[PDB]
């Protein structure tokens, strides 16, 4: 089959900088490319059909060129809402085949997170487990450490960390972190802190509650 | 202005049969410059085309999966479906169903996707746990905890509070079972007079709930 080779895989580029994505063929497929977008949790959405003609509705600042086995994709000043990951799709004799992607992610100022902790609800300790969660908002970059700290204890291997995708709007990142205890270890101890070093920050910053108050 | 929406099971056992479908609103299936396809995504990979199907019913397959894929079309309920057979794991996917032009490689509309699970597991509601907040600007949240399998849909308000909402990935816990938090941040000055309720459906369970976070 007819194989799309899409580069690069990932890239990082400043607002209004030009970002530029090549797309291979393995042999012509004269102009039967098309070129898509796909935000996060949503549908890929055609950005350009026949390798150079922009889609209804698209803005101008995106273009396709090419024809043949060499592909383009290019947006002239990228903008915030456009962090995706685009797709090169061929359907030259009725085969069709994707590109394997490429991660377009928004290079921005440092932002320190926003930490919040959450304590355990009162109907869960019904169940027999306790949950702690911490929240870090709004940060840039993604690299971030977060520790637990029970009593002042470090904790290791009993909690999980989720981090949502660069923002559309502020090309920030939002992270999560759920300690997870049982109930007879929840009510042994009295401080439960969460600690966060991030670049943003002149130096860690704890926030903690009392179990109670 | 022409829409698609996909129904079917999210959750198949091994062996077993996927079975989608796609209907068409807003238009009609029946037209002879449009094929309708089906296109899925593995979670965390790329895009790969099933097949399509033309009103008249004359269809393209993707040769990797013709043995075991049907797409038949109902031009009298404006339908299109889809059949794999004998899925396994690395059939767990989220299928689309999109329009087509041919040539141009042209697929405009899209389905929502339809997250689809492999797996002989057993279907488990979630649980759902206030994230209290405890304080200019408050964080409070909904902890949803111990379901499967993927996915669960949050929103606050019934959709009418966006602003500020992070809906974080969700989780895969030792158990196997998934859990993840909704969190946003409001203004401190709104919490004893605005109510803030988080609502969690998981279609798998036909399970949907609504908490109330309230200041503990």
């Known amino acids: 089959d007819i194989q799309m080779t899409q580069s690069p895989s990932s890239l990082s580029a400043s607002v209004g900088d030009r970002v530029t994505i090549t797309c291979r063929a393995s042999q012509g497929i004269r102009n039967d490319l098309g070129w898509y977008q796909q935000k996060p949790g949503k549908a890929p959405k055609l950005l350009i059909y026949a390798a150079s003609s922009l889609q209804s509705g698209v803005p101008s600042r995106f273009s396709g060129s090419g024809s043949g086995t060499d592909f383009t994709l290019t947006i002239s000043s990228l903008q915030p809402e456009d962090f995706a990951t685009y797709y090169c799709?061929?359907?030259?004799?009725?085969?069709?085949?994707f590109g394997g992607g490429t991660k377009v992610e928004i290079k921005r100022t440092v932002a320190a997170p926003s930490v919040f902790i959450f304590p355990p609800s009162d109907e869960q300790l019904k169940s027999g487990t306790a949950s702690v969660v911490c929240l870090l908002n709004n940060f840039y970059p993604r690299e971030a450490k977060v520790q637990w700290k029970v009593d002042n204890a470090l904790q290791s291997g009993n909690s999980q960390e989720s981090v949502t995708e660069q923002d559309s709007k502020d090309s920030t990142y939002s992270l999560s972190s759920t300690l997870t205890l049982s109930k007879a270890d929840y009510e042994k101890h009295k401080v439960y802190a969460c600690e966060v070093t991030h670049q943003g920050l002149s130096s860690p910053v704890t926030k903690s509650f009392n179990r109670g108050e | 202005q022409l829409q698609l929406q996909e129904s079917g099971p999210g959750l198949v056992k091994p062996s077993e049969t996927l079975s989608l479908t796609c209907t068409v609103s807003?238009?009609?299936?029946?037209?002879?410059?449009?094929?309708w396809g089906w296109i899925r995504q593995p979670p965390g990979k790329g895009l790969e085309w099933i097949g399509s199907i033309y009103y008249s019913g004359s269809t393209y397959y993707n040769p990797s999966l013709k043995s075991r894929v049907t797409i038949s079309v109902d031009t009298s309920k404006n339908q299109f479906s889809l059949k794999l057979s004998s899925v396994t794991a690395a059939d767990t996917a989220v299928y689309y169903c999109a329009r087509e032009i041919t040539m141009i490689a042209w697929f405009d509309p899209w389905g929502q996707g339809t997250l689809v699970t492999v797996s002989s597991a057993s279907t488990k509601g979630p649980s759902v746990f206030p994230l209290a907040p405890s304080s200019g600007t408050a964080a409070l949240g909904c902890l949803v905890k111990d379901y499967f399998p993927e996915p669960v849909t949050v929103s606050w308000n019934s959709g009418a509070l966006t602003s500020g909402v992070h809906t974080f990935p969700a989780v895969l816990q030792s158990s196997g079972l998934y859990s993840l938090s909704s969190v946003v941040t409001v203004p401190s000055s709104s919490l004893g007079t605005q109510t803030y309720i988080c609502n969690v459906n998981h279609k798998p369970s036909n399970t949907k709930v609504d908490k109330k976070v309230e200041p503990k």
């Open positions: 807003g238009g009609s299936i029946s037209s002879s410059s449009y094929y």
């Open positions: 799709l061929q359907d030259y004799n009725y085969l069709l085949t």
